[PDB]
Write a protein that binds this ligand. Structure first.
Ligand SMILES: O=C[C@H](O)[C@@H](O)[C@H](O)CO
Ligand SMILES: O=C[C@H](O)[C@@H](O)[C@H](O)CO
Ligand SMILES: O=C[C@H](O)[C@@H](O)[C@H](O)CO
Ligand SMILES: O=C[C@H](O)[C@@H](O)[C@H](O)CO
Ligand SMILES: [Cl-]
Ligand SMILES: [Cl-]
Ligand SMILES: [Cl-]
Ligand SMILES: [Cl-]
Ligand SMILES: [Cl-]
Ligand SMILES: [Cl-]
Ligand SMILES: [Cl-]
Ligand SMILES: [Cl-]
Ligand SMILES: [Cl-]
Ligand SMILES: [Cl-]
Ligand SMILES: [Zn+2]
Ligand SMILES: [Zn+2]
Ligand SMILES: [Zn+2]
Ligand SMILES: [Zn+2]
Lengths: 327, 327, 325, 325
């Protein structure tokens, strides 16, 4: 059987605005267009909010799921992208901060489930893009950063274990993401995340392997193959993302399709998500995007360059072509 | 005949301090150690200085070459790494700024020659790491950045042509480097540099292809092969650098050796440089280096992790292994 | 004595081409006139160099709209600043020439609004603290050495601007601004030294009380500086502003010591300059204070509104001036 | 009246364990004593929480070295600040407890130096302007709302510190600091409001003239505030500093209006606080002014040296105090 191919909503946005009724229409029109190219599911980033609004968020996303269902999209699956934040930091040295971070992550597990989702992924250990500094604002890197991170990882392990026990009841697999040093202080490599997981009893807490992050920071195809086989053995290879090194066009890139996908397809039968970060205001600065935007039909004025749908269609075509070569 | 393998001094420093007599001893001891691993040449970054000191710089680097010769290193070849700066910007809209940038680049061509070098490479078009901003300090990215860059490239083309005519007299090939969007606004891709070069008559002005930059921003092996063949046809493939995506250990990485080197070895017979950026103060922040430092014997205290020489030795071993596979 | 007020109570951009905003501008003027204000300081937002003729048309149309709304007698001064691009202190002649053309455009806009006084940081680009090529800051003695070259570069450009401004009947009032906002000129002593190399007396000084108090040399030295500027025919404008740039009626502005030497020699307008906590200034001026809420733009609250503060500003200014005369 | 001077003329770190630096410290004290200074304000550089006992030993050894060099009678006050980590205003109890332990350590260090006055920004972390999780700045009304929670968090911690400081005979003088340097408390009115929720009168105020002038409500309101603090037994310390933090003898410090209400109720030391253009302050205070060069550290030049400025500072302070009394 041919695998399910999903696409990330980072082609359009970092905020689903589940309460904005006019925006829901835009979400549904994108999904219907994308489905015609063969996409069977979508990754929804869950924008962070205030802790007093957890119940209201759950209600809004429940209403978004119901609206998608009422539009004929019952069979469409959703995965979520969720990140720890400077405030909602489970690796904090302060117990109350960690507990507040756990409640934040439990809320996001609830939203994932309300969307019918069975996969919640992202940088849920160390806050995304929050490179640590001294009290006098001096950066902390290399050896000093690695010593600092040991304490953060020790702080977070029991919190992630508790979140795993909770997510298991909810039937949501937790897929922690190794992300490149260019974007976040850690975990950057699959070796660093594997080391973190040794202190988390719950197998509900596993990994997402994203090809862009693996190529930018990983240890090569031989070591990678051993890590893939280990994760599948442990029952911790929860999700897989295909994304080029520049995070843009998937069909013109140095993504090592054969070397990356061959070991994964042997042991993983879940969905493969196309994760393309469009040059939208949320990413131009954080990802240093010098490339032109894949203009979004109806939002952006048309131009002579490829549009968001052009790129999405070529992305699924290349992914299927390359998957077919491995079979 | 087996190709010459060079290594970059970015393993140790961004400043050769040609006038510091005690530092020369350190430079020579590194070179002698590295030669034992099989390295036949070295890339020396040329740190920028004040325009009033051009003549003094030429004299100092001439004295450095003579000191290397007096230490038995006559046969050791040097290439240089040189970058345009915010001040010394040949893409400026202001004629005097461009002329002052040309004199800066001519000085660096002179230093290259005084070091016996026949290759000067680097980000010599747009100032390295100087992402443009509005007068009100707002960043400029994506489509807007690409429109901005057309004017900068038009400003720089006649200046680079004049520098090529000068370098040809000096017997120094100029190798402009496509560098990842993570580090600089442009040129990021080999397609962008090829477009720039269409407006430069002088073939003395060509390219360096660095595998780390090609993988991070390039268009994949099929388009890359066409670009390699085009450059060699034009007589503009002046230099080649092997560097992993994370810029660290060359032997444990996703560098696509076969796909990257196969088209190059067919048409290029120059030196292949190992370019490893050690986690030294000059790079920890600019390259966001979360990895531990390859400690430098005698400078840094020893530790249990790999040292600078360990990494250098493994780098040449892997490069030769992979080159042998292509033959 | 005519008392004016800055539009920095509301904005940094007069949006002269925006027909809806013109009504807002007129509304604010009519309200502030009832408090006794006889003129207004309009900041001139910078733009693209291809649009100078259109800018002139837009501001001319704004002046004519004010006139048609019964505001013929309302006077206008302008606030203009050099920018990183439009820098007359640049080492590069074409950059200085482009800076000169920008400032000449702004002189034409001032004149088109009936203005006789264009003021601001027109020598060194406002808030552009210089850095090395490696983005390291330059301060103190190293900065002062760096500024000698910048000042030398700008002197001839300001003189040419002066000659042009004299023709258009617009006085140029260069502003010493605190070190907290800009690298220089920060003190009246630095500006005086700069002006020694400028022939055109059309290029003078604006004295802002907030900047004088923050960086100045005290009341004894200040008196002597004020007397000197009047002898040089270079005291072109005066602004009253408290140290925190907010409420003028509850501040440490040294009214007596600041106004006494000035009122002996100066009979131009005195401008109230209050920087409200609007988005253009909250970060740049580090404003921890609550906004003086703008009626019909901001929702009301228990704290003072923009008009409350503006009314108290003119009342205290009048009171203190009366104590001197 | 005893006149003290801050070591911010030279440093932010007394390096008490550094035997070579101790000689430098003693050298500076002996030189400044000849001008009439009877005491010194020592900033206490923060460190790691595992080193509190060693810090206490180092500063105790420094005090004993001064004593052995004939400086038994030299008095010392300390300058201490909360930090992003050691924040008593944190929402997290363990963070507040760790902040409390840091401040208690610093009370022990003050006492070990013979100090009776520990002062500074010990409520909200100095210069740590709060941001959203996306690194967006928080200013004005939104910041003031944010500070209500921070202040509420800190009140009980400062009260416990007060109880501890009373035992050790060290008065705690919290400092209103300008909005240019820190998010709060910026004004004496904000600090007064904070102190309403603190039971311990050992926790009081330092009034710094530079901060009062930059952010304060003027001489009429200030008099009333000074009278109130004296009635509350909370005016623990006074510092004289010009607005630009440099030369005290050529500035807009309003000597009469600032000192008159204070001298009626306060008879503690008056500290000259000059922040020299040293690397610790050039960027943080945006110092465009030339350094007051430090003899034997900096090469000489034609401009005033650190001692020249310090001598003129005490002379003007004495002169102005004499004008009042
Ligand atoms: O690499 C991207 C990350 O997934 C981040 O943007 C949201 O978690
Ligand atoms: O990618 C690195 C560049 O070569 C720069 O550091 C010097 O030019
Ligand atoms: O002191 C303020 C300045 O004048 C600036 O904001 C406009 O020029
Ligand atoms: O106003 C200055 C502050 O007190 C700070 O630098 C030391 O606490
Ligand atoms: Cl906990
Ligand atoms: Cl806690
Ligand atoms: Cl966005
Ligand atoms: Cl030119
Ligand atoms: Cl020019
Ligand atoms: Cl370095
Ligand atoms: Cl010129
Ligand atoms: Cl605004
Ligand atoms: Cl507590
Ligand atoms: Cl210092
Ligand atoms: Zn991803
Ligand atoms: Zn390179
Ligand atoms: Zn002003
Ligand atoms: Zn102080």
């Amino acid at each position: 059987a041919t695998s399910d191919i999903y696409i990330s909503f980072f082609m359009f946005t970092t905020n689903l605005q589940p309460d904005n009724l006019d925006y829901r229409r835009i979400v549904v029109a994108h999904i219907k267009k994308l489905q015609r190219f063969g996409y069977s599911g979508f990754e929804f980033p869950i924008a962070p909010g205030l802790p007093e609004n957890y119940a209201q968020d759950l209600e809004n996303y429940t209403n978004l799921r119901h609206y998608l269902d009422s539009e004929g999209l019952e069979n469409v699956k959703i995965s979520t992208n969720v990140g720890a934040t400077r405030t909602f930091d489970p690796s904090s040295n302060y117990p109350e901060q960690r507990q507040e971070a756990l409640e934040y992550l439990k809320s996001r597990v609830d939203i994932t489930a309300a969307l019918g989702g069975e996969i919640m992924m992202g940088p849920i250990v160390i806050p995304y893009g929050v490179f640590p500094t001294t009290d006098f604002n001096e950066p902390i890197w290399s050896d000093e950063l690695q010593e600092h991170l040991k304490v953060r990882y020790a702080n977070a392990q029991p919190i992630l274990d508790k979140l795993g026990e909770y997510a298991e009841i909810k039937k949501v697999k937790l897929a922690i993401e190794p992300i490149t040093h260019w974007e976040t202080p850690g975990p950057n490599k699959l070796s660093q995340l594997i080391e973190f997981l040794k202190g988390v009893k719950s197998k509900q807490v596993g990994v997402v392997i994203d090809s862009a992050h693996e190529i930018l920071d990983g240890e090569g195809p031989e070591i990678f193959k051993t890590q893939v086989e280990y994760l599948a053995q442990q029952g911790r290879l929860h999700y897989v993302q295909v994304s080029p090194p520049d995070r843009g066009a998937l069909h013109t890139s140095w993504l090592p399709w054969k070397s990356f996908l061959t070991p994964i397809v042997k042991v993983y039968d879940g969905p493969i998500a196309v994760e393309i970060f469009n040059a939208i205001p949320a990413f131009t600065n954080s990802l240093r995007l010098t490339r032109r935007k894949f203009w979004i039909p109806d939002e952006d004025p048309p131009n002579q360059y490829p549009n968001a749908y052009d790129i999405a269609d070529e992305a699924i075509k290349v992914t299927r072509k390359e998957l077919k070569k491995i079979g």
